[PDB]
Structure formats: C-alpha cells, structure tokens
Design a binder for this molecule. Structure first.
Ligand SMILES: CC(=O)O[C@H]1C(=O)[C@@]2(C)[C@H]([C@H](OC(=O)c3ccccc3)[C@]3(O)C[C@H](OC(=O)[C@H](O)[C@@H](NC(=O)c4ccccc4)c4ccccc4)C(C)=C1C3(C)C)[C@]1(OC(C)=O)CO[C@@H]1C[C@@H]2O
Ligand SMILES: Nc1nc2c(ncn2[C@@H]2O[C@H](COP(=O)(O)OP(=O)(O)OP(=O)(O)O)[C@@H](O)[C@H]2O)c(=O)[nH]1
Ligand SMILES: Nc1nc2c(ncn2[C@@H]2O[C@H](COP(=O)(O)OP(=O)(O)O)[C@@H](O)[C@H]2O)c(=O)[nH]1
Ligand SMILES: [Mg+2]
Lengths: 440, 360, 429
C-alpha cells in the first residue's frame, strides 16, 4: 500500500502538524482518540486511510508521524491536548535547552544528542510500511532546530534511504516581517540541505498568508492557527490523490516528473484558490474557471514574489470536488490565451492536471467556507529567485561586520561555512536566471 | 599604499608516499587543488582535468546538474612554491622584522595552518634542515655580535600559551592561571604579570628553552592527529639596547619580537564524544575570529576608530604589536592534496580576511 | 529541565529577591507555607524551573540568599514569605563590607565565598538540566557589588557554558546615598563585562520617575521599585514556564541581542503601567503595549534611547493575541523611527509570545533594549571616578585591604574601552 511518512521539526513544524493531523482525522472520520465509529456502525473494511495511518488490533489508528523538537514545550502541549491518545507516545524531545535560533547549535552540538532516536523511529515506521512513497518534512528556515536539525536529519536520510522522495514544506522568512534577528544566517546555511538533499521544496512566507487572510477571509487579526490550517489544506490537496479515487490521479512520483525540469530546479510555489469566508461564499459561482484564474493572481501567491516578473516553467493543477475535465481544458486554454502569463519556450505543454472526487473538508471552528470545488496550484517559476535575492542582501548586511558570528563559531561551526553557503545561494540564483533565457 | 601587515602563503610539497599513492589517479587520489599562477596570486580548484569536455557543456544552459564554479582566485602579498627552500622563505619573511626590531620597533610573525600542511616543518624544521626560527635567532645573534662595539645588548625570552582564555607559562609550569594577568603599562607595555624570564646566550640555549616549553604545551589526541595543539603558543624575544661608549646614562631602548603559533580552526563534527574537547575548540574558534577582527580592522582605514582588542586574551596581549609602528607578517601553510581540501579552503579565506583584495 | 539558580547579594539584592519570590509564588499559586493552592493545571506543569519539591507536597524556591551582615536576613526571614526559603540557604557573615568593594571582594567576602559556592554546588547538582544563573545586586554598594562579582567570576570558572544573567542597580547621578559609588560601580563593571552574558541595567532614578509620572504614586517606597523589577524579572523568563506561540528562552534572547561578545548591557521595561484612576480610560491592546514599551519614559535604566541607536530589541508578550498585529506593530516601530535603529541589522527586534497573561491582566509585554545610549551611564560614572582619582579622595580605604592603584587604572581603562566600542556603533556605515 502507498504510504507517506510525515516528519515535523521545530515549533512551526509541530504546529503545522497539529493542523494537518486535525484535518486528516476530520477527513477520514477518525476520532481524536484514534477510534473509527464508521467501522463499528456499518462494518468498514472498504476505506482508504493507510497513506497516513496504521491500523492496530483493537481498531485504534496510529498516525505515521515523527514529532521532533529540541525543547519540550510544544510536544508537551501535544501530549496533554485533545489528541493526546492519537499519536504514539514516541514524540521525541530533547530533555535540554533549545537551539537558541542558530544553525550550529541544532546541527552540531545538541542536534547530535537525539538524531539516533529520530532515525530509529523513522526506521521502525519505514519497516512497517509496504509501499512507502516518500517523506513529508515540515520545518522553518529562519529558526534554530528547524534549520540545523533538519539539515542533519536530511543528510542522514539521504545516506540511508536515498531513492525515496523527500518533500519540504518550509516557512521561508518574509521580506519585511521577521520574528528574530538572525533569520538570514539560518536561512542561508540551510541552502545546501534544501538543494542537494531535498527533491521538491515548497516555500511559504507568513506575510503572504497574512495578506490572504486579511483580503480573502476578512480576518483582521489572524493567528498562526489560520496559517497552519491553510498549509494543511494545501498538503491535503497534494496528498488526496493517494487516498481517494479520482478521474485523473497524480501520485508524488508523477507530480515530481511533470514539475521538476532539472535536478537543481525544484523550488515551486503553492497556492490554494477558493480561500473565502462563509459570508462571501455566496454571491459567487466558484466555478472551475474562476478558481483557476484566481490561482494565477500575484496577490494570491503565498510567497511574497511577483510571477509577472518571471516566466512560468511548469504548472500542476490538482482539483478536488465536482469537476469535469472539459472545464479544466477550457480554463487552461483561457489561461494560455493571456499574455500577462509568460511560459518558457522549451515547455510547450506546460500544465499537468489531476482531478479528485473528494471535496475539501471543513474543520469545525475554522474560517474557510464549505465549497463544492477547489484547486491547488503548484507552479515552478523563475520569479521566486527575486525573493531569495532579498534574503541574500540581509545576509551581507550582517556578514560585512561579522555580527553574531561568534555565537555560531563558538558551537562547532567554522567561519568559512558561512561564505561557502552564500556562494551556493548565488549559484542557485544564477541557474534560475539561465533557465529563463529564450532558446537561441 | 604601504601597510605594516603582510600575508605570505607557502604551499607544501607532496610527500613521497602521498605522491606515489595519489599520482595513480592523475596518470583515493590527489587532484592538486592549489595551482600557483603568480608570486601574488594562486588558484584553488582549477578546471585542469583533461577529460572535462563532456560536462563542460552543462555550464552552458543545457543541463543544470552542475553550474557552481568552485574555482577560486586568491591574491596574497607573497606566495612560496612547493620547491621554494627554507632560505628563500626566510629572506623575504623575517629579515625586515629583525631590522625593525634592532631599529627599536616591535615585530610580529604569526604561523597558521591546519593539521598536516607542514606548519611544524615551516617554523621548526628538522635538525638537518632547520626552520625559520633558527635562521631568525641565528641572524639576531650574528648581528648583535657584529654590533657589540658602541652598543650593549641584552636578550630576554618568554614563552607562554593562551588556553580557554587563560594565560599559562610553559617555561615555568605549576603557576596558578589567576596569577598571570595582562597589565597594560602607562608607557604602552603589555607586561604580563609573574611571567618567567630567561637570558639565553646562543641559539642552542634558545632551542633548549623552546623544546622545554613545548614539552609543557597543552595537547590532546583528536581526529587523525595523534597530537593536536589546543592553545595559542606565544614566544617573545625582548631586545634591550643601550649605548656603550657614548651617552652612558639611564636612557635606553627596548623592543619585542613575537612568534605566535595559532591552533587551527576545528569543525566540532570531527569530534563526536565532544565534551571538554568541544569547549576548547569553541574558544579556539572564537579567538581566531577575534584575531581576524583585529587584522582586517588594522587594514581598513575606515574602521581604525576602534579595533576590538578586548575580545580575547591573545588580541589584548598584542595591543601594541600589530599597528602601523610594528611590522607584522602571517605565514599561512596549506597542502595541495585533496585529502585536506575543505580545510585548505577555509585556511585560504582566513588569509583572505587580512586584506580582501577583490581585484584578480 | 531548564532550571534557574537564583542568588541574592546585599540589601538591595535581598529585597528585590524577596519581592520577586513573592510575585513568582503568587503566579504559580504557592502559599507562604509552601503548599500549592492554585486553580489551573499549567501552574504546576513547569514549576521545577524555580522550585524544588519537598516531601509533604511542598515547594522550596531555588534561592541562595547572601550577605555579610545578619540584619537583612532577619528582615527577610520575618517577612510575609520568609518561611518559604530553605534555612540552610541563608549564608551570611557578621562584619559588613561597609560600602567598600575591596572588603566584599578580597577581605570579608573571600571567607564566605566558599560556603556560598558549597550551597550553589549543592543546588546545581540536584538540577536535571541547568539553564543558567540569575543574580540580583547593586553595584554602588558594599557587600552586594563585591560578593556578587566574586560569585559571578567563580561560577563562570566552574560553569563556563551556562547562562549568567544579572539584574544590577546602576548608581544614579542625582539620586545618590553613598559617597564611594563611582569606585564600586567602576570596579564592578570591570568584572561584569568579562564574566556575564546578560546584564539588565536598572537604576533607581528611572523607577522613581515611573512611579511619579506613569503610576502617579505620591509616596513611592522601595517596595514599588522592587515590584517593577520583579515584574521585569518574571516577564523575562515567562517562556520557560508557560506555553506560547513563539517560545524564547534566555539563550535565544542572548543570541538574538548580543551582536558582539562585550555588548551585553540592556535596558528593561514593562508595558502595561498605569495609574488606578486611569485604567478604565484606555483599551488594552497590542499597539498600546508597543507604544508604552518604546516610549523613552518607560525605560528602567534612565538612558534616553533617542540619544543613541538600538543595536537590538526584544519584546516578550504575554496573553492571547494575534501574531499579525505583533509583527505589524514591530515593523511599524522600526520603519517610523528608522533613525534610532542601526542600518546594518535589517531586523532589530526579536519577538516572543506566551499565552498565559500575568494573573490579573488581560495581556502584558516586557521590553529588553540594547542601544548605545547606555554608554552615557558609564561616562557619568567615569567622570565621577576620575574626579576622585586625580586626588585619591577615599583611596586609602581600598589599598588598606590589599588592592593596588593599577587595578583602578585597569577598571577605568576597560570601562573606557566599552564606551568606545558602543560609540563605534552609535555612528556607522
Ligand atoms: C485590581 C487590578 O487588577 O488592578 C490592577 C491595576 O490597577 C494596575 C494599576 C497594576 C497595579 O500595580 C501597582 O499598583 C504597582 C505599583 C508599583 C509597582 C508596580 C505595580 C496592581 O497593584 C498590580 C496588579 O498586577 C497583577 O495582578 C499582576 O499579576 C502582577 N502581580 C504582582 O506583581 C504581584 C505582586 C505581589 C503579590 C502578588 C502579585 C504581576 C506582574 C508581572 C508578573 C507577575 C505578576 C494589578 C493587575 C492591579 C493592581 C493590584 C492594582 C499595575 O501593575 C501591574 C503589575 O499590573 C500598575 O501598572 C499595572 C496596570 C494595572 O491596571
Ligand atoms: N507558518 C507558521 N510559522 C511559524 C509558526 N510558528 C513559528 N513559525 C515560524 O518559525 C520561525 C522560527 O522557528 P521557531 O518557531 O522558533 O521554531 P524552530 O525553527 O524549531 O527554532 P527554535 O526556537 O530553536 O525551536 C519564525 O520565524 C516563525 O515565523 C506557525 O505556527 N506557523
Ligand atoms: N530598589 C531598591 N534599591 C535599594 C534598596 N536598598 C538599597 N538600594 C540601593 O542600593 C544602593 C546601596 O547598596 P546596598 O544595598 O546598601 O549594598 P550592600 O550594603 O552591599 O548590601 C543605593 O544606591 C540604593 O539606591 C531596596 O530595598 N530597593
Ligand atoms: Mg518544544
């Protein structure tokens, strides 16, 4: 059976995982205590949930997750929350201090005190898996643990598994808003991991999701819960093809084959079209054409970058609900007629399409409205490099005077590893220019 | 135009065993990464591999599997080749320091390098082929004996180490670290407290003192190095000079020659067990950073408002031994083998921090 | 699990510590007898940070009271919360320091430091994972300055990798009640700059100003000053004890606030401060907290931030609030007042949020600044120092205890170097 192993690193990863597992339990009818009343009321035995859950003797369902953090607060909240009985007790915590927001602490000094436990649990979960598709890693670039420990973990996973797909769902720092002073150092030092060891990295910045919540959802004062719920909806749309039958199924191997043109070019943007409140759910048709057009708006992008400044190198549309292929074809033709949306000359096809019959589920107490149709857009485009350039500028503004460098070098790192990584990001940026040039 | 701080980088020659075991790949392997191009310029990791045509086209926008130009162009104030002898090194390295010292101005020579790059061969040498220190002290004593007439000379020797931000005396062990404290004098003299002094009468006595001090130096087995230094060793030769037949009075002069071993930077990843061995390394790294923050600050005229001397014991110990009134040199020793590739790269850019010469 | 060892030295340190333990015991629902009578499960979740368990369901604070006369110990033990402390932790002498740094550092304090360190070792060995230490004391005094700095030096020698916080009361230029404040303050700053990771520079003048003009109190007493410092101390370590949306321990703040290893002198503040009459006339929201935090009059160090540039800032909010509002307000503060923030740090503000407000308030916030204006404080002390040193006004009381003038010269030089380092970043490129 198809499986996918979820890994959550750091506070951001753990909270996004809380949202994701709430969403999956709602989707599959699993109660917070792991029991499935559908199997007892009717009889069950004809359901698809093995992509995320494992079924024990007594009808309990254990999610395929590994929650990791270098301090106990978030995992302790999970251990005493509504979903305390859902997860296995092996939610791994360091019984010591956190990474203190620097790459070196989470990668070299304290990260190597729990790597063995994490790898052992991942090995056990993989052994329990029969048709393991890949890994879904959630973390944050700008933090501590989420950067250094993620780098160490993905190095080890590449050494061990190698041939399995690995997907990052990272929280890139925003251009202006930032919740720490040393975010650029950690973000740049994670370039190697996201480039060489990952296979497809989905970045989302907090400013874009805040603007989406303000404009579309009419939430003036959103919390991280709303952001996590939106990210959970996107991940659910990505993984729905493995779970529920549909007209055109798109598994991960296909998603990557049709999306990634070159090995180093694996940094797409993710958008979710019908983000809208219940009050505004009326007064609109929300047909396939409307949501497909909304996917391409620069305001709806969840990374603060303008696709109009670059060229669309590939696109993957994953529809959910009452959708017919002919409407999708008409919408794609309507998009191709527009001149504001530019495509490279070496990708005449352009679009990958998948359709699923399962409509999106509404979380109780959430903000997203119940809709009949939805679509998740995954777009490989050159505009994302512009965002990277902004981050690089910040790095230079600190690295000229070697501010905060003593903290990093005093915990096992050497100085050159800074400049090396800046050169890596530079090269990555150069590639995203060279692909965009028209064929001679 | 003129700067008192200069950088000299020496390339080690390939040993017989290493040459034999690595050439096979050229004809693991060696793939020499250091290709000297000029006396002020070297290239790190060139594309000199003969079978390179198949994947040089990937640099052209055809296949984006490799596009990171790893070649680097490094500029230094002096380059010493693999065939450059010890005399050629010394003649362009420490003779002007000796001239400055006999003039009456302080002088300093740093020696930096990772494990296996030939730092010990460069500074200490062998009994058959002695190192730079022997030539320096021999020339000192020869010049003093030449200048015996009309001037009286006295020589004082000190040899200490900086370890975990604490000062220890090597010629006089079993002294509490709290006793040794830096004490800047009112006349710009660093003057460490309770430091033993010795008055050797010849180079042989100096080397006996050096060996006795090195026997007490702090070392631990780490990685592939059976004996790895954990401290910055500082040797100080104080030359006191006065007039013999002329103005016989209390007035005199005295200068200092500093020879400073710098423990190489260490990636903790190499240390697994870690522990005390991890903390020392951390301090060492911090100390090196502090030294960089001085030298670059002493090369940029803009940042001359305030040089951060206080960030480490080493930099404070050299407050008046790095400025414009003291000739400073840095001997960066590297290895052209690939086995030390990453380390050498780091070392080179450390040497690049002294004067970021952008022009190639 | 991330446990702090609290040390109290001198009269000022002991009084602030007593009020701080009163506040902390109220926050966690601990009676003076030591029993727990709270009404929330989160209070006991991370109570091991400050308290050790004891057999009959009791909680003894992990405090170490230190002095060189027994008067303050008798005053504290007879207070409302005196019985909560461990009797064995009351380490004291009989002959006071007499407002002399040398006596507290060399002659009298050297005898008691061994006992204090024995108790410190006993307290630290019982800790599952020691986050660091926490000292409260005054630098202008006698016992406090010398014993505190000696303890800091020796604990740093013994626990090099742990955090060493410090809540120092800097002598004021106007509010003065001790003739030899400059010597003690200079000789203390000479040691703190080397042997600490964070130093929160509190001053009595700023607290008196806050009491007079913000709280509108007619007759402030030292209890109110200790109340303000206690609120700051509780708010600093709020993320160690309660959950939140952005957790930030002491080490994270130290990493995000100390650009260079010597610039670790901070300006604290507490946002929701108002008079009792004026409570109903304001809506308590995040923008009000930000405006009161970044107001120059709310600082506790009596250094005008407008006379310098913020090297770094940290804001630790408490309560249920939106992250978007917090980020928007911090960005707005940085953009509107760009002249007061260094150009070579694109984001000067660290942010933390805890979801458990301080008992009686809907929400609160703690501000921790690091700006070059603090150099002015040292400059003032330096002036007074030289004014007493070219003539050697009271020097014989110090050299009589075995000190030398070279120590005074070195302390002055180190303070001047710190001032120059801060000046080097007040201007920049
Ligand atoms: C009935 C009521 O709630 O009234 C408020 C009140 O009027 C005000 C004026 C309170 C009041 O504070 C003062 O009067 C005061 C005087 C000198 C120094 C500091 C405070 C209050 O006393 C203080 C008190 O604070 C608390 O309850 C906090 O939990 C606070 N408690 C303590 O510090 C404390 C001290 C000893 C014993 C028990 C608790 C706290 C703050 C930070 C961390 C932990 C606890 C509060 C809200 C009020 C009164 C009672 C009037 C204020 O203070 C605090 C700490 O909230 C002054 O600025 C705020 C604004 C409040 O509106
Ligand atoms: N989208 C989203 N981002 C979050 C959330 N929580 C934290 N972040 C981001 O995470 C970044 C820093 O990571 P942390 O939350 O501190 O967690 P960490 O990466 O493990 O770093 P540590 O503090 O050392 O544990 C911040 O810049 C936040 O923007 C969240 O709930 N949702
Ligand atoms: N906030 C506060 N400050 C105090 C208190 N007692 C003394 N001080 C300050 O501390 C300084 C005197 O130091 P002192 O406590 O006598 O030092 P000690 O004699 O070594 O304990 C003065 O400048 C006072 O402003 C107090 O109870 N609260
Ligand atoms: Mg945690």
């Amino acid at each position: 059976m198809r499986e996918c192993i979820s890994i959550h690193v750091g506070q951001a990863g753990v909270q996004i995982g809380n949202a994701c597992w709430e969403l999956y339990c709602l989707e599959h009818g699993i109660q917070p205590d792991g029991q499935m009343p559908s199997d007892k009321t009717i009889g069950g035995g004809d359901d698809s949930f093995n992509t995320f859950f494992s079924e024990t003797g007594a009808g309990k369902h254990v999610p395929r997750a590994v929650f990791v953090d270098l301090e106990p607060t978030v995992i302790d909240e999970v251990r005493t929350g509504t979903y305390r009985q859902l997860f296995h007790p092996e939610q791994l915590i360091t019984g010591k201090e956190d990474a203190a927001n620097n790459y070196a602490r989470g990668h070299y000094t304290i990260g190597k005190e729990i790597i063995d436990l994490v790898l052992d649990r991942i090995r056990k979960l993989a052994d329990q898996c029969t048709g393991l598709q890949g890994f879904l890693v959630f973390h944050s670039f700008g933090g501590g643990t989420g950067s250094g420990f993620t780098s160490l973990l993905m190095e080890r996973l590449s050494v061990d598994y190698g041939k399995k797909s690995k997907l990052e769902f990272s929280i890139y720092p925003a251009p202006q808003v930032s919740t720490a002073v040393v975010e650029p150092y950690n973000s740049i030092l994670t370039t190697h991991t996201t480039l060489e060891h990952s296979d497809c990295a989905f970045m989302v910045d907090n400013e874009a999701i805040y603007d989406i919540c303000r404009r579309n959802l009419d939430i003036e004062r959103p919390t991280y819960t709303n952001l996590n719920r939106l990210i959970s909806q996107i991940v659910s749309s990505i993984t729905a093809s493995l779970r529920f039958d549909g007209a055109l199924n798109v598994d991960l191997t296909e998603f990557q084959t049709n999306l990634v043109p070159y090995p180093r070019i694996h940094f797409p943007l993710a958008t979710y079209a019908p983000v809208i409140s219940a009050e505004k759910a009326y007064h609109e048709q929300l047909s396939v054409a409307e949501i497909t057009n909304a996917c391409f708006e620069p305001a709806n992008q969840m990374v603060k970058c303008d696709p109009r400044h670059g060229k669309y190198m590939a696109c993957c549309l994953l529809y959910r609900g009452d959708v017919v292929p002919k409407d999708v074809n008409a919408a794609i033709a309507t998009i191709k007629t527009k001149r504001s949306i530019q495509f490279v000359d070496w990708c005449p096809t352009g679009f990958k399409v998948g359709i699923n019959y399962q409509p999106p589920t509404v979380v109780p107490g959430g903000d997203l409205a119940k809709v009949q149709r939805a679509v998740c857009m995954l777009s490989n485009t050159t505009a994302i490099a512009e965002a990277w350039a902004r981050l690089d500028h910040k790095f230079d503004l600190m690295y000229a005077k070697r501010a905060f460098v003593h903290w990093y070098v005093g915990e096992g790192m050497e100085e050159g590893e800074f400049s090396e990584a800046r050169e890596d990001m530079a090269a990555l940026e150069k590639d995203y220019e060279e692909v965009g040039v028209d064929s001679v | 135009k003129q700067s008192s701080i200069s950088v000299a980088v020496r390339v080690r020659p390939f040993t017989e065993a290493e040459s034999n075991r690595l050439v096979k790949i050229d004809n693991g392997g060696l793939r020499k990464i250091i290709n000297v191009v000029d006396d002020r310029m070297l290239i790190f990791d060139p594309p000199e591999t003969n079978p390179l045509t198949k994947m040089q086209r990937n640099a052209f926008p055809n296949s984006f599997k490799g596009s990171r130009i790893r070649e680097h162009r490094f500029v230094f104030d002096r380059l010493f080749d693999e065939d450059c002898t010890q005399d050629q090194v010394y003649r362009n390295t420490t003779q002007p320091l000796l001239d400055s010292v006999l003039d009456g101005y302080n002088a300093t020579v740093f020696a930096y390098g990772a494990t296996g790059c030939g730092k010990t061969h460069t500074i200490s040498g062998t009994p058959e082929d002695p190192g730079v220190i022997f030539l320096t002290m021999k020339e000192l004593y020869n010049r003093i004996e030449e200048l015996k007439d009309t001037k009286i000379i006295d020589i004082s020797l000190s040899y200490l180490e900086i370890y975990n931000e604490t000062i220890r005396d090597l010629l006089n062990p079993m002294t509490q670290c709290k006793n040794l404290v830096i004490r800047e004098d009112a006349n710009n003299k660093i003057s460490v407290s309770n430091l033993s002094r010795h008055r050797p009468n010849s180079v042989e006595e100096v080397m006996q003192l050096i060996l006795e001090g090195n026997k007490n130096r702090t070392c631990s087995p780490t990685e592939a190095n059976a004996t790895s230094s954990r401290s910055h060793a500082v040797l100080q030769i104080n030359v006191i000079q006065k007039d013999r037949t002329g103005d016989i009075t209390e007035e005199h002069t005295f200068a200092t020659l500093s020879i400073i071993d710098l423990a190489g930077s260490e990636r903790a990843a190499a240390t697994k067990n870690r522990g005390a061995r991890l903390n020392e390394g951390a301090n060492i790294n911090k100390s090196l950073l502090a030294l960089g923050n001085c030298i670059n600050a002493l090369c940029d005229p803009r940042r001359r408002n305030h040089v951060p001397y206080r960030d480490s014991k080493l930099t404070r110990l050299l407050k008046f031994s790095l400025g414009g009134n003291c000739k400073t040199v840095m001997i960066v020793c590297v290895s052209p083998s690939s086995q030390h590739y990453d380390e050498t790269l780091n070392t080179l850019k450390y040497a690049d921090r002294a004067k970021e010469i952008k022009t190639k | 699990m991330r446990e702090i060892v609290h040390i109290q030295a001198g009269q000022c340190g002991n009084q602030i510590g007593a009020k701080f333990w009163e506040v902390i015991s109220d926050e966690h629902g601990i009676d003076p007898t030591g029993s727990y009578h709270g009404d929330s499960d989160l209070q006991l979740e991370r109570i091991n940070v400050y308290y050790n368990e004891a057999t009959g369901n009791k909680y003894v604070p992990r405090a170490i009271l230190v002095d060189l006369e027994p008067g303050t110990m008798d005053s504290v033990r007879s207070g409302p919360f005196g019985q909560i402390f461990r009797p064995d932790n009351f380490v004291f002498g009989q002959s006071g320091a007499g407002n002399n740094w040398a006596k507290g550092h060399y002659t009298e304090g050297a005898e008691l430091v061994d006992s204090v360190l024995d108790v410190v070792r006993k307290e630290s060995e019982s800790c599952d994972c020691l986050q660091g230490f926490q000292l409260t004391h005054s630098l202008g005094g006698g016992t406090g300055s010398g014993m505190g700095t000696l303890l800091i030096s020796k604990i740093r020698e013994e626990y090099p990798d742990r955090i060493m916080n410090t809540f120092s009361v800097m002598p004021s230029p106007k509010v003065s009640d001790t003739v030899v404040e400059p010597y003690n303050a200079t000789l203390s700053v000479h040691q703190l700059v080397e042997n600490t990771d964070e130093t929160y520079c509190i001053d009595n003048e700023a607290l008196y100003d806050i009491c007079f003009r913000t709280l509108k109190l007619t007759t402030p007493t030292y209890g109110d000053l200790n109340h303000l410092v206690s609120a700051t101390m509780s708010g600093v370590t709020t993320c160690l004890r309660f959950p939140g949306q952005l957790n930030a321990d002491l080490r994270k703040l130290a990493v995000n606030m100390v650009p260079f290893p010597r610039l670790h002198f901070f300006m604290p503040g507490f946002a929701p401060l108002t008079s009792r009459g004026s409570q109903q006339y304001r809506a308590l929201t995040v923008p009000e907290l930000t405006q009161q935090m970044f107001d120059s009059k709310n600082m506790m160090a009596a250094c005008d931030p407008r006379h310098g540039r913020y090297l770094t800032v940290a804001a630790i909010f408490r309560g249920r609030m939106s992250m978007k509002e917090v980020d928007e307000q911090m960005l707005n503060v940085q953009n509107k007042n760009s002249s007061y923030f260094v150009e070579w740090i694109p984001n000067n503000v660290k942010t933390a949020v805890c979801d458990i407000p301080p008992r009686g308030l809907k929400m609160s916030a703690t501000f921790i600044g690091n700006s070059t204006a603090i150099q002015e404080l040292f400059k003032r002390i330096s002036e007074q120092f030289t004014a007493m040193f070219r003539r050697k006004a009271f020097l014989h009381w110090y050299t009589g205890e075995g000190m030398d003038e070279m120590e005074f010269t070195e302390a002055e030089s180190n303070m001047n170097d710190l001032v120059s380092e801060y000046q080097q970043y007040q201007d920049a490129t």
